[PDB]
Amino acid sequence: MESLTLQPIARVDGTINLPGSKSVSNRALLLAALAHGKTVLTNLLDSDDVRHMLNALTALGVSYTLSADRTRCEIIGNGGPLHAEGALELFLGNAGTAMRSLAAALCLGSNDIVLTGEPRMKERPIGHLVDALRLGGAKITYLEQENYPPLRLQGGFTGGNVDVDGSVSSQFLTALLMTAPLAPEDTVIRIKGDLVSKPYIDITLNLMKTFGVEIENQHYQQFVVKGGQSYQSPGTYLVEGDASSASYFLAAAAIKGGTVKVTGIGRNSMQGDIRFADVLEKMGATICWGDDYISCTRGELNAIDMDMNHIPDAAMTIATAALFAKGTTTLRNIYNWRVKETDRLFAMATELRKVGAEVEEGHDYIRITPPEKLNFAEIATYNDHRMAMCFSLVALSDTPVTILDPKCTAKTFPDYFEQLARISQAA
Numbered sequence: 001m002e003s004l005t006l007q008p009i010a011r012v013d014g015t016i017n018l019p020g021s022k023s024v025s026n027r028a029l030l031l032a033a034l035a036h037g038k039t040v041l042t043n044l045l046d047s048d049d050v051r052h053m054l055n056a057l058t059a060l061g062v063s064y065t066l067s068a069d070r071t072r073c074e075i076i077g078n079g080g081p082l083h084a085e086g087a088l089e090l091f092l093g094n095a096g097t098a099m100r101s102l103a104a105a106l107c108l109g110s111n112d113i114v115l116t117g118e119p120r121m122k123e124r125p126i127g128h129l130v131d132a133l134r135l136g137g138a139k140i141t142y143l144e145q146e147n148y149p150p151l152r153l154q155g156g157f158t159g160g161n162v163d164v165d166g167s168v169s170s171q172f173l174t175a176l177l178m179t180a181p182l183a184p185e186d187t188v189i190r191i192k193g194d195l196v197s198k199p200y201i202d203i204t205l206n207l208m209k210t211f212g213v214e215i216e217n218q219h220y221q222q223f224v225v226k227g228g229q230s231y232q233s234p235g236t237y238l239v240e241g242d243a244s245s246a247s248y249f250l251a252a253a254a255i256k257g258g259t260v261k262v263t264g265i266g267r268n269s270m271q272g273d274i275r276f277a278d279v280l281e282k283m284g285a286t287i288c289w290g291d292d293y294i295s296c297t298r299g300e301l302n303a304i305d306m307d308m309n310h311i312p313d314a315a316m317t318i319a320t321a322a323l324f325a326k327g328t329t330t331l332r333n334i335y336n337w338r339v340k341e342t343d344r345l346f347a348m349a350t351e352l353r354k355v356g357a358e359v360e361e362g363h364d365y366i367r368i369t370p371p372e373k374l375n376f377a378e379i380a381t382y383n384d385h386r387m388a389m390c391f392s393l394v395a396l397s398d399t400p401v402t403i404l405d406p407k408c409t410a411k412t413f414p415d416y417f418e419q420l421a422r423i424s425q426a427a
């Protein structure tokens, strides 16, 4: 199969202009499609997950144009819920941000649409969201395994009292929050218990406000939404650079810099993953903040023991950075790594051991003891962009590393290796 071998990188230094945020991009596209008026999105991410959302909007009849590099999108708002019949099939790859949000949005009014995706997506849970949508009136059918896509959506979400489990994915609550304002009746969303990946809920509320809608957040345990609202185009909107994509470059500097500056995000960013910089600082790196940049400069690197529930995606980057730290690193409260692009706890533990680390794969945590020196390994990537990007960091040592299926980075960052190479120096 395809592979890429990275030669040892002696030092990293430079500036990277980040690709757009996948999280912001897909929310902005769906809201722009539902809104009244024309929205111009700039710095939109061009990656598989965004392309699947764009294809879905095209299939649903939404009109838009894209610039040559696909980062500028002029969307003609539908001025209300999107519709299709005939069990129209929308293929969503392994894009959770599209699968979960569209599963809820397309329950407004009447419809007959099927949502499906790649094999792994048919193994990623969605029952908590379906349960909530049904309590609000939606008719949803599991076409294969109960609690997982594919789904046949026949509409009917009118609002009301809806309970939702927030313990496995914040994407379910995000989906409900963006959908409820357009339902005819008011909706009260009660969180059953714990809420994981909380910062992503803040991203959703931020985007909804940009598109003209606010709701009552009662300490993240209950959300009161007024029905009968309409989203409105914000005019021109700048999509933040991707803070998760930034993690690899800031970590590279913490390991082998040099100073690496990423632009497109800064101290005012809405993304929870900018807090990844705080972790590097705790490990011994120096961080600089600007209005439109974050930079990291090599200091030292010491192991940490931290609850990473607030930054589950960027946290994976700490797992390979831990190979270069002094001491044993423990990342806790990351159970849902198991239900994402791949089971990330199994995958990370398996590949880390291949380069020499002693690793304890806990049920919802991972403990990593680095080897005195790394060895060469051919890294399996599990159709997971982040496994490829995380393991690229192994090359910031005396050994090369071979990454299988390097194009899997295209899920959120097609140009990843060219960008890592841009900051890679021989001297």
Ligand SMILES: O=C(O)C1=C[C@@H](OP(=O)(O)O)[C@@H](O)[C@H](O)C1
Pocket: 022, 023, 024, 096, 097, 168, 169, 170, 171, 174, 196, 197, 200, 312, 313, 336
């Ligand atoms: O809503 C979003 O943009 C995302 C929320 C997170 O999922 P969970 O809430 O399942 O942790 C994150 O892991 C995913 O990559 C993107």
